[PDB]
Design an enzyme around this catalytic site. Structure first.
Site, short mmCIF file in Angstrom:
data_model
loop_
_atom_site.label_atom_id
_atom_site.label_comp_id
_atom_site.label_asym_id
_atom_site.label_seq_id
_atom_site.Cartn_x
_atom_site.Cartn_y
_atom_site.Cartn_z
N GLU A 1 11.66 -44.28 -32.67
CA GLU A 1 12.55 -43.31 -32.03
C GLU A 1 12.12 -42.94 -30.60
O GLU A 1 11.68 -41.81 -30.35
CB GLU A 1 12.63 -42.04 -32.88
CG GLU A 1 13.13 -42.23 -34.31
CD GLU A 1 13.38 -40.89 -35.05
OE1 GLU A 1 14.13 -40.05 -34.52
OE2 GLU A 1 12.82 -40.67 -36.16
N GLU B 1 13.55 -44.39 -42.58
CA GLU B 1 13.13 -43.02 -42.88
C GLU B 1 14.25 -42.24 -43.53
O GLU B 1 15.36 -42.17 -42.99
CB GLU B 1 12.68 -42.28 -41.63
CG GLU B 1 11.22 -42.35 -41.34
CD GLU B 1 10.90 -41.71 -40.02
OE1 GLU B 1 10.22 -42.34 -39.20
OE2 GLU B 1 11.34 -40.56 -39.82
#
Lengths: 461, 461
Positions: B165, B365
């Site tokens: 990210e 995730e």
């Protein structure tokens, strides 16, 4: 008083190598290497390294051309600027961005882009490794580069050309010393002529596999100056017969008709100098003629019988069949050494109409070079090139007669938009509607620039 | 009843900075320096220095995860542990031996390694000397550190990721204050978003030269939470579009499509804030898209028109085009402050399948954090985390729907395997299948760990 078909295109012509300069270009073409090594071979020592600075000033340059009434601009993409690795046709990121920058700026200035793929500018590395256009591998590499041009720029370029005047590459590189490598060899030139005809044809095929919209056309630019016989003496007529086949049909027929002219191939065979062709190659040539034709014309060409018999043992050359003739009473551009003869414009238009299916065609080059134009600057620094206007009127009048007789001519492109670098002659002769002071790269419309803008709005004169 | 493809990977996700502790680590990353310097910014005063003690306890830790049904373990190698001299990417011997130990021990416990290179952990020295991800030099030094990882560990690692990210680094370090250095500068954040995308593509390129085997793959981990419009009013629809482009396409498009979204770069250009890019860099990004995509999802994002005109005089921020919206009737994780919306799982799968070539991807995730799990210990000290089993059920059910519609999802990785240190929130919320009593570093599977082992056996539930 002389008017032209509705939709007729009023254009200007140049090429990448004669305008861009070599700023940040990855590869040398034969002229770059020629100038780097032998600068004394170029007028006033001016070579292509800066030329008319088009790499740096393209945006304002096209605005000047827009002012001078260029509705369409034809120029060329340099192989040596676009491609990183020739074997793969991998892209030079910076060169791709440049041509995107100029095409988009063309549209932003409402100029129709006409993109030629090759203008005398073979990468010198391909001559060193493969002897250039003598190599059918080099033919394939050219097609892979053309393919890249189509995929990157096809989305907003409608009008393409495979080659500008491949005959000048054949004569220049392999016959008369005009171009580096300066090889003097008839048999090789014959093979190069073949190879470029084949390369042009595979390009058209590839182009037709990748072209989407129906407005997308691809063509070839040839000089179609007739070979006028000096007289009716049979020997002079036989010299024109062969000069016509060799200077015009050698490229016109394969490009438009799909085949080489049979009398020529018979001649080359008897002389033992015919090209190596394969039937698969000739089939591609038959099946991918051009969509349209670009025609270059500047000065006529006349031919008489050769001083000595073509059976004399001498190295084989197409010249063993014809010798240039100077017509008494001719009309001359005395400083340039060229006869003026607008009637050839009409003859050319007729030939295309009568014998080549009246294929869509344009005058893709026509113009007049004069040296030392600073002698005609007025008070405000505008060249008073009335001579250039007179030249266009005469040839455009000849053009209009051809059209009125039914020839399918669809546009007229002046050489040149801005003064550009003319190979070894460099800027000795200026052709532009727009002057370039090459010391400062400051450009200024001439008087012809305004007359040509007005010509386009009136579609006549 | 809910069933998954043959070969589905059931995994868990953490990072090096959140587990290892700082034992014998040569360099401080930005969080290390932040805690050593403002510990009061950290929940219960708990920093990264011990974390979940993975440096010391890696072997038994991995035994426990295998018990929990961790088939693949995704974690990260710390730049600040592995590298001695950043300019050279020379090696710290202890760090090299540490990652060799954990990779060998994953293999010995039948856990497939999934090694990410970067999880928010910029070396603080590189921020002080160069301002970090603002520097294209820092970009190159990251490629050197990546290169070392591939040579040292690629013989037994098949699955790599460049970044976890990047958006959180852009947001945290340059827009909202979440990460030291807590800069608040719109235009710098834009340059950093570009630079990090560029670092990823240069890493992918370097990886595809040093990868031998065909099953070696490199990807990148993004949060692809859709930007849901508050209403069908055109202003709210416009806010969501920019929110979508900014939060998702800014990274999804260069990574997978090889280019930045046209409408976003048009907006950034208009606003005066576009990154400084070169054609060569853009070519690197176009030529090296990821093999795989790791997808993080926790909770939805909804967006409405901003309160004031984007043309108001104010420092440029992406947020001038969108305001977050809370929907009445939303399902809430009350204590955490997050909406619950498993339908987003299906929406992400559809978007990858339809608009991103159905590229191989995994949920990398998904999980639920809960504070005070002491309240839920059974009589034998096992967290009864039935809420976490429910949260997984709802989100897997939605995932299965996306797979059945044809989306190329290949795994599901829970955040987290063992309770790990969540930056400034430290251990306030717990995500693990396995509890950590961080005072004694004693780990204990929870109930959800048992469920997760059954899940992997049945390949469904």
């Amino acid at each position: 008083m002389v008017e032209f078909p509705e939709g007729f295109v009023w254009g200007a012509a140049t090429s990448g190598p004669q305008t861009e300069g070599n700023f940040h270009k990855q590869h040398q073409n034969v002229f770059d290497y020629w100038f780097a090594t032998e600068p004394e071979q170029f007028d006033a020592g001016v070579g292509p390294d800066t030329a008319s600075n088009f790499y740096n000033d393209y945006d304002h340059d096209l605005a000047l051309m827009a002012q001078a009434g260029v509705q369409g601009l034809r120029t060329s993409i340099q192989w040596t600027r676009l491609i990183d690795d020739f074997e793969t046709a991998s892209l030079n990121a910076d060169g791709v961005a440049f041509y995107n920058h100029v095409i988009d700026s063309m549209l932003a200035h409402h100029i129709t882009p006409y993109i030629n793929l090759h203008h005398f500018d073979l990468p010198v590395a391909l001559y060193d490794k493969y002897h250039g256009w003598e190599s059918k591998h080099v033919v394939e590499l050219f097609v892979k580069f053309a393919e890249q041009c189509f995929k990157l720029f096809g989305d907003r370029v409608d009008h393409w050309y495979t080659f500008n005047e491949p005959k000048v590459v054949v004569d220049g590189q392999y016959l008369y010393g005009w171009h580096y490598p300066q090889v003097i060899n008839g048999p090789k030139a014959v093979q190069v002529a073949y190879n470029m005809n084949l390369a042009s044809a595979k390009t058209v095929a590839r182009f037709h596999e990748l072209c989407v919209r129906p407005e997308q056309q691809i063509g070839i630019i040839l000089n179609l100056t007739p070979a006028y016989a000096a007289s009716d003496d049979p020997a002079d007529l036989a010299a024109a017969e062969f000069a016509e086949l060799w200077s015009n049909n050698l490229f016109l027929d394969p490009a438009v008709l799909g085949h080489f002219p049979e009398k020529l191939v018979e001649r080359l065979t008897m002389d033992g100098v015919l090209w190596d062709a394969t039937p698969t190659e000739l089939a591609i040539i038959a099946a991918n003629p051009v969509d349209c034709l670009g025609v270059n014309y500047y000065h006529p060409f006349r031919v008489q019988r050769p001083d000595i018999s073509p059976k004399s043992l001498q190295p084989w050359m197409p010249d063993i069949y014809f010798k240039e003739y100077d017509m008494p009473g001719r009309m001359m551009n005395v400083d340039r050494g060229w006869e003026i003869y607008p009637q050839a414009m009409t003859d050319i238009a007729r030939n295309i109409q009568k014998n080549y299916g009246n294929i869509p065609w344009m005058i893709s080059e026509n113009g007049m070079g004069v040296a030392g134009e600073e002698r005609f600057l007025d008070k405000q620094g505008v060249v008073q090139d009335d001579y250039r206007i007179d030249f266009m009127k005469e040839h455009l009048t000849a053009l209009a007669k051809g059209i009125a007789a039914g020839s399918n001519c669809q546009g007229y492109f002046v050489w040149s938009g801005i003064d550009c670098w003319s190979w070894n002659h460099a800027y000795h002769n200026r052709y532009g509607l727009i002057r370039n002071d090459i010391h400062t790269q400051t450009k200024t419309l001439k008087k012809s620039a305004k007359w040509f803008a007005e010509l386009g709005e009136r579609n006549g004169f």
